[PDB]
Design an enzyme around this catalytic site. Structure first.
Site, mmCIF file in Angstrom:
data_model
loop_
_atom_site.group_PDB
_atom_site.id
_atom_site.type_symbol
_atom_site.label_atom_id
_atom_site.label_comp_id
_atom_site.label_asym_id
_atom_site.label_seq_id
_atom_site.Cartn_x
_atom_site.Cartn_y
_atom_site.Cartn_z
ATOM 1 N N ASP A 102 41.911 42.350 40.353
ATOM 2 C CA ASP A 102 41.300 42.012 39.066
ATOM 3 C C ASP A 102 42.204 42.420 37.936
ATOM 4 O OD1 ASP A 102 39.319 40.964 37.415
ATOM 5 O OD2 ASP A 102 38.232 42.894 37.191
ATOM 6 N N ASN A 103 42.032 41.791 36.780
ATOM 7 C CA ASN A 103 42.604 42.258 35.510
ATOM 8 C C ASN A 103 44.112 42.212 35.461
ATOM 9 O OD1 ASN A 103 40.081 44.611 35.953
ATOM 10 N ND2 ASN A 103 39.984 43.018 34.336
ATOM 11 N N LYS B 129 44.578 50.497 36.393
ATOM 12 C CA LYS B 129 45.556 49.422 36.474
ATOM 13 C C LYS B 129 46.948 49.900 36.835
ATOM 14 C CE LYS B 129 41.823 47.479 35.542
ATOM 15 N NZ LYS B 129 40.923 47.316 36.765
ATOM 16 N N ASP C 100 40.411 47.079 41.703
ATOM 17 C CA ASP C 100 39.712 47.031 40.418
ATOM 18 C C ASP C 100 39.547 48.408 39.818
ATOM 19 O OD1 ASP C 100 38.445 45.648 38.286
ATOM 20 O OD2 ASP C 100 36.449 45.788 39.248
ATOM 21 N N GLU D 187 35.603 39.198 31.877
ATOM 22 C CA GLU D 187 34.175 39.229 31.988
ATOM 23 C C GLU D 187 33.523 39.182 30.614
ATOM 24 O OE1 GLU D 187 36.315 41.481 33.476
ATOM 25 O OE2 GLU D 187 35.638 43.535 33.232
HETATM 26 O O1 LIG Z 1 39.669 49.956 33.389
HETATM 27 C C1 LIG Z 1 39.105 49.107 34.084
HETATM 28 N N1 LIG Z 1 38.756 49.370 35.352
HETATM 29 C C2 LIG Z 1 39.128 50.617 36.040
HETATM 30 C C3 LIG Z 1 38.140 51.771 35.922
HETATM 31 C C4 LIG Z 1 38.962 52.751 36.728
HETATM 32 C C5 LIG Z 1 38.159 53.892 37.239
HETATM 33 C C6 LIG Z 1 38.527 54.296 38.593
HETATM 34 C C7 LIG Z 1 39.603 55.000 38.995
HETATM 35 C C8 LIG Z 1 39.563 55.246 40.413
HETATM 36 C C9 LIG Z 1 40.455 55.939 41.247
HETATM 37 N N2 LIG Z 1 40.313 56.078 42.518
HETATM 38 C C10 LIG Z 1 39.203 55.464 43.135
HETATM 39 C C11 LIG Z 1 38.281 54.740 42.426
HETATM 40 C C12 LIG Z 1 38.424 54.637 41.044
HETATM 41 S S1 LIG Z 1 37.486 53.859 39.903
HETATM 42 C C13 LIG Z 1 38.786 47.778 33.515
HETATM 43 C C14 LIG Z 1 38.913 47.619 32.144
HETATM 44 C C15 LIG Z 1 38.640 46.389 31.509
HETATM 45 C C16 LIG Z 1 38.785 46.206 30.045
HETATM 46 C C17 LIG Z 1 38.551 47.290 29.210
HETATM 47 C C18 LIG Z 1 38.626 47.153 27.853
HETATM 48 C C19 LIG Z 1 39.036 45.930 27.368
HETATM 49 F F1 LIG Z 1 39.140 45.721 26.000
HETATM 50 C C20 LIG Z 1 39.337 44.820 28.127
HETATM 51 C C21 LIG Z 1 39.200 44.988 29.498
HETATM 52 C C22 LIG Z 1 38.162 45.303 32.280
HETATM 53 C C23 LIG Z 1 38.001 45.493 33.657
HETATM 54 O O2 LIG Z 1 37.570 44.441 34.441
HETATM 55 C C24 LIG Z 1 38.326 46.720 34.280
HETATM 56 O O3 LIG Z 1 38.198 46.765 35.660
HETATM 57 CL CL LIG Z 2 31.836 36.119 32.896
HETATM 58 CL CL LIG Z 3 32.419 45.096 39.217
HETATM 59 MG MG LIG Z 4 38.014 44.784 36.491
#
Ligand SMILES: O=C(NCCCCc1cc2cnccc2s1)c1cc(-c2ccc(F)cc2)cc(O)c1O
Ligand SMILES: [Cl-]
Ligand SMILES: [Cl-]
Ligand SMILES: [Mg+2]
Length: 213
Positions: free
Chosen positions: A167-168, A142, A139, A197
């Protein structure tokens, strides 16, 4: 303050300490009624719950904690002595996640790691005493689902039957990851169609069970 801090404060003021289900409900209410945020949410969370209950994993790795919603969801279903390691690259969100888990009473089940997956995955065996993982929840970025799946295999962290749950895979989407696992004899894949979500927008989870090399 930030949206993530507001979500933590809302849990602290509207959930019951030590009650994970109240914490999930509080986060979903806040994110439905006040401010959207990228938690896995209850639609996809119910599919995650069903997968966790099927496999009863002893050792789960999560890539991408955010505010700790998915960590609370999974850790609340773990058997006694089972553990979750969760990686978070944003130090503010790592701190919010730790506080969320403390509030829920789940802090003895979860280790929240602050760093990048490409740096931390090669340290899992020696530093966090991991042999192999039972389940991985993806998660995080992507465009890292595919490279970090390959890095996990390189590091010897997968075994026959390790469950990847992603996810996603539809929104924002992870097209290289999906094409790869779905085309590979090393994975048995199932798609669980759901909703993004808090939104009436189709998304989904992919389950990809590792079959060895
Ligand atoms: O970007 C998303 N999740 C990733 C955040 C990454 C940060 C990290 C990088 C990293 C690297 N190494 C270790 C740990 C980590 S944490 C995300 C985005 C949407 C979304 C956003 C706008 C939209 F219009 C529609 C859906 C929905 C979701 O459910 C998501 O999960
Ligand atoms: Cl939901
Ligand atoms: Cl979460
Ligand atoms: Mg997600």
């Amino acid at each position: 303050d930030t949206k993530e801090q507001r979500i933590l404060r809302y849990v602290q003021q509207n959930a019951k300490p030590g009650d994970p289900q109240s914490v999930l409900e509080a986060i979903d209410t806040y994110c439905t009624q006040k401010e959207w945020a990228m938690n896995v949410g209850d639609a996809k969370g119910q599919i995650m719950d069903a997968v966790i209950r099927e496999y009863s994993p002893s050792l789960v790795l999560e890539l991408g904690a955010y505010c700790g919603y998915s960590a609370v969801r999974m850790a609340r279903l773990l058997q006694p002595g089972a553990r979750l390691l969760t990686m978070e690259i944003n130090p503010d969100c790592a701190a919010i996640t730790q506080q969320m888990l403390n509030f829920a009473g789940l802090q003895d089940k979860v280790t929240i790691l602050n760093g990048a997956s490409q740096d931390l995955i090669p340290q899992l065996k020696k530093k966090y005493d991991v042999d192999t993982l039972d389940m991985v929840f993806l998660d995080h970025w992507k465009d890292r689902y595919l490279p970090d799946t390959l890095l996990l295999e390189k590091c010897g962290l997968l075994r026959k039957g390790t469950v990847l749950l992603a996810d996603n895979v539809i929104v924002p989407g992870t097209p290289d990851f999906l094409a790869y696992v779905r085309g590979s004899s090393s994975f048995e894949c199932t798609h669980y169609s759901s909703y993004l979500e808090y939104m009436k927008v189709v998304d989904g989870l992919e389950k990809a069970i590792y079959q060895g090399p």
